[PDB]
Amino acid sequence: ETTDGVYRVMTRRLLGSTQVGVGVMQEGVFHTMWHVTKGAALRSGEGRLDPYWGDVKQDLVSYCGPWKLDAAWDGLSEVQLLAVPPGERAKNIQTLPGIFKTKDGDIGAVALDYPAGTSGSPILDKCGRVIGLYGNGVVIKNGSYVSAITQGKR
Amino acid sequence: DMYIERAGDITWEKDAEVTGNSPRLDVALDESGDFSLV
User: Per the record, what ranges lie on the membrane's Cytoplasmic side (chain B)?
Assistant: First the structure.
């Protein structure tokens, strides 16, 4: 199963399922954050998805092929988090990104704080292109989470 | 046992709610992929 879309990543323990994250299927490749799966194989129906590429520092992993998502934030426009919360239908949250300033350049960041099982949710530009994934970031104040817009390299 | 389940199209929504600040933060990224505030 490789139909394009956003997907929940679920885990079955000994008793009951839970959502551990989210991912993007595009061009036959499944994309998520490394810390969601830690590189483990995934089941998709009766088939198996094997990891293909991964990098802990970028916190990204791809299944069935190399990373395909290459769009980037234009640094000016609003974006949408396509959040897939556990137990709820997918929903779009529009926001203007802030910025992580690093010694190696700036990274867009969204100051949106959704439940943990939302990690891997895609961030979209106004043309619907995935410009990165949600869920690796920092906490600034008390509980105010800010996520990098994490994008790989195609 | 991890498995995936489709949850929607990848689409921009004209009726999305809008929210969130736009903070500018100095950060560092270490080899484990962890951001920290500078």
Answer: 1-38
Instruction: Output the CA torsion sign for B26, B29, A120, A73.
Output: positive
Q: Are residues A79 and A128 in the same domain?
A: yes
> Min CA distance, B16 vs chain A (Å)?
5
CB contact under 8 A, A6 and B18: no
Q: Provide Rg for chain A, Cα atoms.
A: 15
Same domain, A54 and A86: no
The answer to whether the CB atoms of A93 and B5 lie below 8 A apart is no
Q: How many CA atoms lie within 13 A of A28 on its CB side?
A: 4
The sign one gets for the Cα dihedral A87, A89, A93, A99 is: positive
Residue count (chain A): 154
Which token pair is A117? 């099982």
Residue A1 shares a structural domain with residue A60: yes
Phi, psi of A117 (to 5 degrees): -65, 5
- Which range marks the domain in which residue A30 is found? 1-69
Residue at A144: amino acid letter: S
| Technique used by the depositors | X-ray
